Amino acid sequence: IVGEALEYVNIGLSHFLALPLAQRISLIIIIPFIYNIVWQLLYSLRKDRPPLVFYWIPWVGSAVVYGMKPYEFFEECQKKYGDIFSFVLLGRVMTVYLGPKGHEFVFNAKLADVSAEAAYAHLTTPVFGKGVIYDCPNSRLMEQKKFVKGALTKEAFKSYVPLIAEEVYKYFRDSKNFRLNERTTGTIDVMVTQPEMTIFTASRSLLGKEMRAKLDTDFAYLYSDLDKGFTPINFVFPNLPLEHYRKRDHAQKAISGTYMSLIKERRKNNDIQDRDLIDSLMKNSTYKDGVKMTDQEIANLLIGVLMGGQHTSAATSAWILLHLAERPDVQQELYEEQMRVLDGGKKELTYDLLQEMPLLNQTIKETLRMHHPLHSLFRKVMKDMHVPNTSYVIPAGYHVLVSPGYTHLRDEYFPNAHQFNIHRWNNDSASSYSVGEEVDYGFGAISKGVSSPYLPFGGGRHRCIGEHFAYCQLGVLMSIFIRTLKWHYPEGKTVPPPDFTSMVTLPTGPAKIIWEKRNPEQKIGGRH
Ligand code: HEM
Ligand SMILES: C[C@@H](c1ncncc1F)[C@](O)(Cn1cncn1)c1ccc(F)cc1F
């Protein structure tokens, strides 16, 4: 007789529903703790799954160590399990594939196998607005990228160089952090100066003079509010009836409103030129099926493009200054190249002359090797994926994570990888090189292979289209920094470690350097 036992299941259920509140909340905690632990041990025997990093807390997973020190986490997991392994992160399973094979597996994955917008839309759609980037099918994104890349031409860069130069000189003249007509030395926090210089230079060139003029007013604080809404917290908590979220949504509406105002003023006056990215998208933003982007979608695409470029570029010029601050030898070598290429300063800097500055471009290239601004790129797996030359299957509903910034730091691919050495790029100063066959996904021919161990701009359909703009901006900025200033660390300070929590690998601030004028008597003209 088992019937007697099934009575005691029923009895035990009734004795359970009647335990003291102390016993039950303790049971409410301990039942999923134990179940999680036993599920992982059962998981460890599936041979069609990559090894899964062990974690104590359910749902949270390895979120803490991953969020704080992702590269240290990857190295420890790589020593234990090899190059492919999974970990739990705030409710999701992330499968990491380290190394060049990982780059191929993720960046060159079939469109049907993985979805970037399914991973990212919750981060970005609340910040940028609807209908663009990741709030739209991949085919729409592919053509959005074509539209933006159409104002990112060599001819556009030739006109952007003197405009970016003007902004840098105006920032040296007017900003409280410098005031070079009044002060010959000073101390700056590069995490204060570089965000400002980046937004001023990117606004003037990509958005135009009107939009740049608005950053001289209270309007600039909307950018700070919108910027604060770009945060990993959006991945778990993208809308909370709280104040941070309200200034974000307000800023998005107010900034996109300002761009639509300009777009509609330009069209009401037929004042549509080739000045900036606004002119360009107004003339060129009709999809191949004949649908035109709305003025709202144009404005939102501007926000996302300007904000993406904001955080990668500002982080990078911060790291460049910070590495050069302890390398007066490198500053000296870069200064000599400035003097030779620009005839002692008697040539005005042009886009063409920037391309004849290999050591300056190698300094950018080397900073992007040691400080890849995005430590992790993500996709959501949409169809079960087999990992070649293994028995592993990554099931739909998992996410795949690739980290070229981690391979940038491996000695096997970059000897003495933790040493800043711009000369490892001698006779190889190009921002990136397609090492063979090319493919076009809708925004131009790009490298078909994505196996390069140096992959600062990703690859495949989601590859960056901002690299030449970033080199132009960083190049103008650094050419002027080098010709105008020397700089060094306060006593006993050195390169700060990265803060990875922002998802952008920023220097831990305050990161202070001391500048001094190379020509204490040099004056910057213009009105102020
Ligand atoms: C140092 C500067 C930069 C670095 C290292 C960088 C890095 C990257 C990487 C790694 C990706 C691939 C993302 C993924 O696969 O999920 C990407 C995509 C992209 N980036 Fe950049 N970026 C930089 C600057 C810029 C700038 C200046 C702009 C705009 C002016 C920009 C706009 C974009 C866009 C539109 C994409 C396409 C995303 C997609 O197709 O899903 N980036 N970038
Ligand atoms: C999604 C986002 C990101 N941020 C942080 N970790 C991983 C990421 F994928 C990012 O790739 C960053 N970025 C890349 N180039 C410039 N910015 C991005 C892409 C396109 C865009 F229009 C705006 C934008 F923020």
Author numbering: 7 to 534
The authors write:
A common mechanism of resistance among fungal pathogens occurs due to mutations in the enzymatic target of azole drugs, the cytochrome P450 lanosterol 14α-demethylase (denoted as Erg11p or CYP51). Azoles inhibit the demethylase by coordinating to the heme iron in the active site via a heterocyclic nitrogen atom of an imidazole, triazole or tetrazole ring. We have created and analysed the structure and function of surrogate triazole resistance phenotypes in the yeast S. cerevisiae by creating Y140F/H single site mutations in lanosterol 14α-demethylase that have homologues in numerous species of pathogenic fungi.
The pyrimidine ring of VCZ occupies a similar position to the non-coordinating triazole ring of FLC but projects further into the substrate channel. The 5-fluoro substituent of the pyrimidine ring projects towards Y126 forcing this residue close enough to interact with the heme ring A propionate (2.8 Å; as seen in complexes with the long-tailed azoles PCZ and ITC). The key water molecule (743) is present and forms a similar hydrogen-bonding network with the phenolic hydroxyl of Y140, the heme ring D propionate and the tertiary hydroxyl group of VCZ. An additional hydrogen bond is present between the 5-fluoro substituent and the key water 743 (3.0 Å), which is shifted slightly towards Y140. The water molecule corresponding to water 790 in the FLC structure is not present at this position due to the projection of the pyrimidine ring. However, a water molecule (750) seen in complexes with the long-tailed azoles is also seen here.
